[PDB]
Amino acid sequence: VNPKAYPLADAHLTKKLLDLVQQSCNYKQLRKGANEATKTLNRGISEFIVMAADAEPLEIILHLPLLCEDKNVPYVFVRSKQALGRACGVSRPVIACSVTIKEGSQLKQQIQSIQQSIERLLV
Amino acid sequence: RKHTWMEDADSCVAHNALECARAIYAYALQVFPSKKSVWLRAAYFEKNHRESLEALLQRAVAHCPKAEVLWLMGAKSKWLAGDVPAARSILALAFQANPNSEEIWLAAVKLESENDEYERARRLLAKARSSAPTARVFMKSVKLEWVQDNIRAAQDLCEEALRHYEDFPKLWMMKGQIEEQKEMMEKAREAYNQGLKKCPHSTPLWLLLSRLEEKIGQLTRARAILEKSRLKNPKNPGLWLESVRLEYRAGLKNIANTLMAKALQECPNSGILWSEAIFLEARPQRRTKSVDALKKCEHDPHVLLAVAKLFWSQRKITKAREWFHRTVKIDSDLGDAWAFFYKFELQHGTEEQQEEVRKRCESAEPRHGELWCAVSKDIANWQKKIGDILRLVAGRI
Amino acid sequence: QTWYHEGPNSLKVARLWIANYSLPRAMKRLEEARLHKEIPETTRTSQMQELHKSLRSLNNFCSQIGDDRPISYCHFSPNSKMLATACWSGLCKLWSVPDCNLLHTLRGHNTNVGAIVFHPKSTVSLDPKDVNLASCAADGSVKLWSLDSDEPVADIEGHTVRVARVMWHPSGRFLGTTCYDRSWRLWDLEAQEEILHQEGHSMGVYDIAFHQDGSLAGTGGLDAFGRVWDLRTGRCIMFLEGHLKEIYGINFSPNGYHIATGSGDNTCKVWDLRQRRCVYTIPAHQNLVTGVKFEPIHGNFLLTGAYDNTAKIWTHPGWSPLKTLAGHEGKVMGLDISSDGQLIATCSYDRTFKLWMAE
Amino acid sequence: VTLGVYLTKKEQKKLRRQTRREAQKELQEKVRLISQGVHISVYRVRNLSNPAKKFKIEANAGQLYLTGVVVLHKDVNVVVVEGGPKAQKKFKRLMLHRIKWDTNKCVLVWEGTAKDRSFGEMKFKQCPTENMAREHFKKHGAEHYWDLALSESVLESTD
């Protein structure tokens, strides 16, 4: 993968992140695309932002950790963009996405667990 | 039945007239003697709707003993309309009815300090501190001792207030402010550290300690004091705003932006943190930051004042005047918003807008401001009016 | 299945020099332990109570923000001179302790910097024009740097993996570095070449720390097994096991028995060397313990950090929560006590590094 | 290791059409013819003498298939639970928000990860002295958490 994509999750961590992204997009609480993810991170409404290491170029996803330095949000990089695209439900591969917080959503505990598990990978 | 009659009198005073409400209040006062609540309601109805208020105050003093609030309202109505040495004699007669020096002694000291012969006010403050020392009574005595000159008697009174009221951080903050105006500066820092270790959670005392540690150089100790103040609450918005201001005062603008981002991530529902994040951001990037602060923390006076300052900085007075009017209508008790509105009226506009801003500032007294408390706590402008303090706050911007 | 490999003669000469420099150091440490054991229990208990009372009143000091990048490691200079910090950017500034003033920021890196640990005799018996500190980045680089040059030195290109941490030997001629290639390198300062590449773990080593005498050297990484190798002929017999997570911090006590290891399973392992067992499994914090620092030559405490906003200063021995050194806003990455024992610096992920000091 | 394979609604709809078509064809043809790390938490409560709260804590420990112990002493109640991450999160959410204690307050002393479980089942131990509770915790190899809880209680009572 790309060395500039940091931090990188494991296999089960990427599976849990894809399941959380599918549960957020199925409940109309996720934003696909890097532009919508960075806009939700700059707006202060994005709970978590996930990236992908299989992006061409890999520097275009480099705004996703830097926005994590601008809003104090946990960031993570997936292994492939095609699995994140299917996880988002979009046939096109997704190199970036965002799980945003809602007004008392049922998946808030899973989003908090994903944010607690993704913050320990960057060490 | 008396509560229903008082509610019907309040509804009649709010509805159509004031004669029937005064008649119902007189009937409720002449039917049976009540507590101080009915007397305070009758005094408020007499003040909101000269001689009748003085007669009601005399009837409350003659029929309802041990009523300090009604006696203080009657003394204020006698000093405003009737006479100041008559209100002084009324307060001296009320001192023989209530021997407690909680609120009558402070009101008598304020009435003696509003006029001349302040040595009698200092003697009354010393007698109130030696008879029944309290927190606010010792704070007012230390303020009256330090407004004239920084004598050693003021330091002894501050030491006695710190020994008798160590749980109250106001006496420690007053002792630190008195020692900061002396020749040395280590005693003020020691008193501020003792007040921070004895409260243990004192936000303005730790803010004054951080200001003293930053103004005397070696501001890493000031940043450590700000971090200890933010962790001692824990996660205080005022300590985080003070740490962001201390980081923005130096050459580390990116560290101040990171501290503001951490304060927004730890407390998004803060007006002062949103104003600091809107002021520390870029000028073409503030149009989205102000919208995010309005969407996150709506109906806030600090966010509205920051939006008014951003509209005035963008050479748009027609939007800045409406933003200042909305900030004055949302919360008229703010000092920084009123000072910014007065500065915007004095910078761009006719004299009618400045006169309206001065009337709005003189109607409701501003408090708890960032720039208002810097001039309202100093000894040079402690016994000044609201208009001179507003002019000094507007001229220092 | 302990595999053996033939090494060069320079590695054997450096091992013999390390043994000849560590054996009188171990003899002096045993003599100091015997002199401390001859002291009565009342004076030692009074000194321990005074140390606990000094550590309980630990206030924050020397808090200065480095840059916009979060701080990853911090190492205190000898004789209470300064403190070298290493953030996530390419700059490695050195705050003048206790004033925490930025002066002579060492730049030259591109990726996220790892552990910038100075020499144990840099400010004492070494010149500032020569190499005084050694830093590493997220790529393969172990770069030396001075204190008054603002430029790196000739690095060693023998590492091609993510060098997480690096620690210089107390003798000064050697320096260990934990890489991500399932091995740990031991570079030399006199020969200016990599003398040994110890590969005994299943995963890449994270933190490496040598003993106070220079004979033993602790290891640890993502293989969930702690290793304690010898500088004479290898043959690590003190294998630490029990942690189910990745060991992110190792600290060697000045006493020859106790050794504190920090793992990611929210616990700390204080193991003995004369018995080769786990003496204490201390639940320090709830987050992953990354930073861990032993006491100075007095040997009374241990400061273990975590991925939370706090850091636990515990007694040694006893494993009691003596001090909760909170105050940070992010993950506390990197902490080290000074040579005097009156102050202990600690960095965090909030782009600032503070210190706990006596009031 | 395995990754979830999700599709869009349209793709699924196509599958439905095919599925129904296949079903119709078939129909028409039928008519025509805790290991690898366990989360271990330890909480400290001021008073656990209530029978209803203790019964609710025992029911939450038994229904979540989590083992451990609940030791009681003089104003020091150490409740140690051990199991999966979701069971420990549900037990912490029940003991922190659902279990209403109130001077009696319950706080989580520690929450870490161990290799395997120490206790077999949740047994409500009782000891008036701290030495008996320390010996009962050291018999199962959990004396460090009890010592940390006692030190935290002593630091809360002193400060």
CB contact under 8 A, C288 and A120: yes
Distance CA B162, CA B167 (A): 8
Considering only CB atoms, which chain B residues are within 8 Å of A73? 265
Residue C327 has its nearest CB partner, among B218, B227, B259, at B227
Radius of gyration, alpha carbons of chain C? 19
| Cβ-contact C62, B220 below 8 angstroms | yes
| Cβ-contact C107, C142 below 8 angstroms | no
**Of B180, B181, C329, nearest to B192 (Cα)?**
B180
Residue in chain A closest to B274 (alpha carbons) equals A44
Q: How far apart are the first and last CA of chain C?
A: 54
Distance CA B383, CA B380 (A): 8
The contacts of residue D88 (CB under 8 Å, 6+ apart) are D39, D40, D41, D66, D81, D82, D111
- φ/ψ of D138, rounded to 5, equals -75, -20
Q: Return the residues preceding each gap in chain A, C–N over 2.5 A, or none.
A: none
Decide if A71 touches B, using CB distance below 8 A.
yes
Buried b (16+ CB within 10 A) or exposed e, C31-40: eeeeeeeeee
Which residue in this structure is represented by tokens 């996150």?
A: B296
CB contact under 8 A, B224 and C99: no
**Of C153, C139, C92, C74, nearest to C111 (Cα)?**
C139
Q: Which residues pair with C221 in a beta bridge?
A: C205
CB contact under 8 A, C68 and B218: no
- Which CA distances in Å does C143 have to B373, C107, C134, C238? 52, 11, 6, 30
**Of B42, C274, A52, nearest to D3 (Cα)?**
A52
Residue in chain A closest to C68 (alpha carbons) equals A69
Q: Specify the fold of A1-123.
A: 60s Ribosomal Protein L30; Chain: A; (3.30.1330)
Domain boundaries, chain A: 1-123
**Of D146, D138, D22, D1, nearest to D73 (Cα)?**
D146
> In which element (H, E) is residue C218 found?
strand C216-218
Size of interface A-C (CB pairs under 8 A): 21
Decide if A44 touches B, using CB distance below 8 A.
yes
Helix B203-215 / helix B237-249 crossing angle, nearest 10 deg:
10
Considering only CB atoms, which chain A residues are within 8 Å of C247? none
- The number of residues in chain A equals 123
**Of B207, B263, B208, B266, nearest to B240 (Cα)?**
B263
- φ/ψ of D144, rounded to 5, equals -70, -40
Cβ under 8 Å to B: C residues 88-117: 95, 99-101
Decide if D120 touches C, using CB distance below 8 A.
no
The contacts of residue A4 (CB under 8 Å, 6+ apart) are A58, A59, A62
Distance of CA C86 to the CA centre of its chain: 14
Distance CA B154, CA B173 (A): 13
Q: Ramachandran region of residue C278, left (φ > 0), alpha (ψ -120 to 50) or beta?
A: beta
Considering only CB atoms, which chain D residues are within 8 Å of A87? 4, 6
- Cβ-in-10-Å burial (0-12, 13-18, 19+) of D9 comes to exposed
Give the residue from A68, A70, A115, A119 with the most B CB atoms within 10 Å of its CB, the best one to mutate: A70
Distance of CA D81 to the CA centre of its chain: 6
The contacts of residue C55 (CB under 8 Å, 6+ apart) are C301, C313, C322, C323
- Cβ-in-10-Å burial (0-12, 13-18, 19+) of D26 comes to exposed
The three-class DSSP label of residue D69 is strand
Decide if B261 touches C, using CB distance below 8 A.
no
Please, what's the largest Cα pairwise distance for chain D? 87
The three-class DSSP label of residue D136 is helix
Pairing of strands C247-252, D106-114: unpaired
CB contact under 8 A, A22 and D89: no
- φ/ψ of C62, rounded to 5, equals 60, 35
Distance CA B387, CA B230 (A): 35
CB contact under 8 A, C244 and D115: yes
Q: How many CB atoms lie within 10 A of CB B376?
A: 19
- φ/ψ of B66, rounded to 5, equals 55, 40
Residue B265 has its nearest CB partner, among A42, A43, A72, at A72
Distance CA C179, CA C187 (A): 12
| Cβ-contact C240, C225 below 8 angstroms | yes
Q: How many CB atoms lie within 10 A of CB B70?
A: 23
Decide if D35 touches C, using CB distance below 8 A.
no
Please, what's the largest Cα pairwise distance for chain C? 55
Considering only CB atoms, which chain B residues are within 8 Å of A72? 261-262, 265-266
State the smallest CA–CA distance between residue A97 and chain D in angstroms. Answer: 16
Residue C63 has its nearest CB partner, among B227, B234, B262, at B227
Sign of CA dihedral C128, C132, C135, C140: positive
Give the residue from A18, A86, A108, A113 with the most D CB atoms within 10 Å of its CB, the best one to mutate: A86
Decide if A109 touches B, using CB distance below 8 A.
no
Amino acid at C219: T
Q: How far apart are the first and last CA of chain A?
A: 18
**HSE-up of B343 (CA within 13 Å, CB side)?**
19
- Which CA distances in Å does B13 have to B54, C218, D12? 19, 84, 70
- Which CA distances in Å does D155 have to B235, B246, D72, D158? 22, 34, 18, 5
| Cβ-contact C326, C309 below 8 angstroms | yes
CB contact under 8 A, C283 and D110: yes
Residue in chain C closest to D38 (alpha carbons) equals C244
**Of B235, C327, C164, D3, nearest to A122 (Cα)?**
C164
- Which CA distances in Å does D46 have to A1, B3, B141, D106, D134? 52, 45, 44, 6, 18
